[PDB]
């Protein structure tokens, strides 16, 4: 898609994933967080550790990633690599022996 390729190129030409995606620094990034539990893989009574398969639906608005759909043939949504953008650093506080944060950087629906 030439339209979608141009859109992706123009969105990220000077995008910064370091700063928060607010218009003004006094604003608060409001992130909707929904835990989906896909599978209770294991309960380890002896080690007192529970292994679960989950999805963390995180939703927030990035002020810089708006576009006008009529500029790009009516493209209203795109999928982009999540490593490109700023993300909330949600950490599992009570991690026992897994990863603290997300490690599977699947695509972002923008």
């Amino acid at each position, epitope marked *: 898609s*030439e*339209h979608e390729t*141009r*859109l992706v190129a*123009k*969105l990220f*030409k*000077d*995008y910064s994933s370091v700063v928060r995606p607010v218009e003004d620094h006094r604003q608060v990034v409001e992130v909707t967080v929904g835990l989906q539990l896909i599978q209770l893989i294991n309960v380890d009574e002896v080690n007192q550790i529970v292994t679960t398969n989950v999805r963390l639906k995180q939703q927030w608005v990035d002020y*810089n*990633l*708006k*576009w*006008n*759909p*009529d*500029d*790009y*043939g*009516g493209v209203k949504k795109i999928h982009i690599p999540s490593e490109k953008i700023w993300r909330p650093d949600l950490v599992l506080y009570n991690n026992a022996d897994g990863d603290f944060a997300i490690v599977k950087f699947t695509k972002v629906l923008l």
Partner: antibody
Amino acid sequence: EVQLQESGPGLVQPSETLSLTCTVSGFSLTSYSVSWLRQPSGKGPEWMGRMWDDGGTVYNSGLKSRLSISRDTSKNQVFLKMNSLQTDDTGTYYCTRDERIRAINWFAYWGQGTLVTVSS
Amino acid sequence: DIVITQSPSLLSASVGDRVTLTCKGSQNIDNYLAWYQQKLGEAPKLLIYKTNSLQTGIPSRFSGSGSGTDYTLTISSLHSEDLATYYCYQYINGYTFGTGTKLELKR
């Protein structure tokens, strides 16, 4: 500095084809997008399409079949061509340089506009 | 697309008056609204974008305000050169233009 000048026929017959040339000076087409606007008689303006700086094009979905846009970066000219003309197409046609912020675009400078009359 | 309406349709004001032109959308325009000035037989000139960013070289007497679906252009001191038609337009969802407010010196 920035100037745009539309040119073309003042009268065109219905079902004929219209061609307009937007001459450009003070900036390079390779770094600024050029949109085309028309103001139908007794109506507010409407956006027709854009020539991107990268040379791509996008058109108003109502006019996409009727429109084509091309450019010559050496002459600094943008060409609008339209077919299946009808009396409703009579109005002032503008070419505009478009400013940008990220993916958002808006019309920043207008040409003087060429009045096109569609009548037999 | 976001439908836009302007008021007044025709406004008469004396030189030096403060005047405000109102622009209202059918939907949240998200401050992606711009104002441009048009004169008979003259190329339209952008005055303001993003509802309050003054275009370079425009007299500072022009100022913009608004949020959500209501926006205003203010001319704090009407000069004789400012008699023209003013269109607001929106560029966050499609491209829609107001009907335009025609501004004439009071007689």
